[PDB]
Amino acid sequence: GFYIRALFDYDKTKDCGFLSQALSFRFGDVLHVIDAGDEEWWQARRVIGFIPSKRRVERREWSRLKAKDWGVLSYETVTQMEVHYARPIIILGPTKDRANDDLLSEFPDKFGSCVPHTTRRDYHFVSSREKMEKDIQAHKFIEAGQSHLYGTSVQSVREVAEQGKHCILDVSANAVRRLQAAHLHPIAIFIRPRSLENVLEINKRITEEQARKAFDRATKLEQEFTECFSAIVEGDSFEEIYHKVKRVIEDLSGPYIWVPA
């Protein structure tokens, strides 16, 4: 058959109280499709039941958008490939900073921070801003910005990854595609707030206004970068989100991983 990665969560018993041979899966789950003979329902098992076909899932999506005329994600085929480095980590969403620091302090042997370049051991110093600006234009950085310039080079990430540890990247989701192109498949973990109230329950260190801003930024982050996420994590407290972040990292950190195309 063939393999696909789900780009949405699916649980009909949970959503409707309907019992059937339907398979339940979460965003990011890799599914082994054994029989795609039925146009509406595919037979598969998480890497044995039925899941809606690409045709069925999208038809439903397009129908939704068409409802707004004058007023789309389903699955992606994946292949397994071997990796010779430790996968970089990109945690996104509310509390991502806390999760980053705790992983670094709690497991220094497994996680490390890379050495950023700067125009201003700690940093890779660059004398010329011009040379810097050109390297940026030359796609040497996964992400950069500024009164001095700062950037995280593909090479610096590579060094940490080759040394055998997951490199904790403090970058935007835009960096995911950048890393994929450099053949350094990151583990992009999105922490999704279940609601505005949920943000204050997973992050007990911010104000109500900060939580609203956080919820809004999370919503726009999911709308635009879902395909780039390796996993989506939710919870009723940071502890639970942290526990899941660790589990997701482990689950996706083997010598063999699933990738697009």
Side-chain angles (χ1 to χ4, degrees), residues 190-203 206-207 209-211 214-215 217-219 221-222 224-226 228-252 254-261:
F190 176 53
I191 299 171
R192 174 209 285 137
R194 286 166 182 163
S195 69
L196 166 52
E197 306 85 68
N198 179 235
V199 176
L200 298 171
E201 56 188 304
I202 64 177
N203 186 344
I206 63 179
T207 70
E209 182 52 37
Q210 280 180 107
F215 186 67
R217 277 184 279 91
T219 295
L221 203 51
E222 173 171 30
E224 174 169 358
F225 292 93
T226 289
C228 303
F229 302 161
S230 304
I232 293 178
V233 124
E234 299 189 348
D236 296 297
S237 67
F238 177 73
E239 287 62 52
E240 171 179 10
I241 278 161
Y242 186 63
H243 164 69
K244 293 179 170 171
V245 167
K246 288 184 289 188
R247 290 296 178 287
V248 166
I249 293 174
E250 186 183 345
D251 188 44
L252 302 166
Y256 296 94
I257 67 175
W258 300 94
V259 298

Side-chain angles (χ1 to χ4, degrees), residues 33 47 49 86 96 136 158 240:
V33 177
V47 170
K96 64 124 184 178
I136 289 175
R158 178 95 63 186
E240 171 179 10

Side-chain angles (χ1 to χ4, degrees), residues 36-63 65 67-108 111-119 121-126 128 132 134-136 138-139 141-146 148-154 156-161 164-203 206-207:
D38 188 289
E39 311 93 302
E40 294 295 294
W41 302 89
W42 288 350
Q43 202 175 307
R45 61 176 292 286
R46 302 210 313 85
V47 170
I48 169 54
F50 288 98
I51 62 176
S53 72
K54 184 184 194 68
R55 178 177 177 191
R56 189 179 180 83
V57 173
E58 308 196 316
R59 175 203 293 129
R60 198 277 181 180
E61 246 58 58
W62 290 121
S63 176
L65 292 176
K68 295 151 69 173
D69 296 334
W70 326 123
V72 166
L73 297 177
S74 54
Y75 310 104
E76 66 171 346
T77 68
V78 291
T79 306
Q80 190 174 59
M81 64 162 237
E82 166 167 40
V83 149
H84 307 277
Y85 53 90
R87 298 184 74 170
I89 314 296
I90 300 181
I91 300 172
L92 304 156
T95 75
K96 64 124 184 178
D97 284 312
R98 181 169 178 195
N100 278 332
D101 296 321
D102 294 6
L103 290 176
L104 288 165
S105 60
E106 194 164 318
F107 310 91
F111 307 89
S113 290
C114 72
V115 181
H117 279 266
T118 180
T119 51
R121 195 179 76 68
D122 301 302
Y123 294 85
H124 278 297
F125 298 82
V126 183
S128 178
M132 182 72 165
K134 294 184 178 177
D135 287 334
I136 289 175
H139 310 292
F141 298 86
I142 296 298
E143 184 162 290
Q146 190 184 303
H148 301 292
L149 291 172
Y150 289 78
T152 299
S153 73
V154 175
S156 295
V157 175
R158 178 95 63 186
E159 256 133 3
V160 175
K165 59 182 56 175
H166 301 300
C167 181
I168 294 301
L169 299 178
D170 181 0
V171 302
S172 66
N174 290 285
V176 176
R177 310 295 298 186
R178 309 267 75 184
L179 286 166
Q180 298 185 297
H183 305 289
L184 264 170
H185 295 286
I187 295 177
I189 310 182
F190 176 53
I191 299 171
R192 174 209 285 137
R194 286 166 182 163
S195 69
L196 166 52
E197 306 85 68
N198 179 235
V199 176
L200 298 171
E201 56 188 304
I202 64 177
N203 186 344
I206 63 179
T207 70

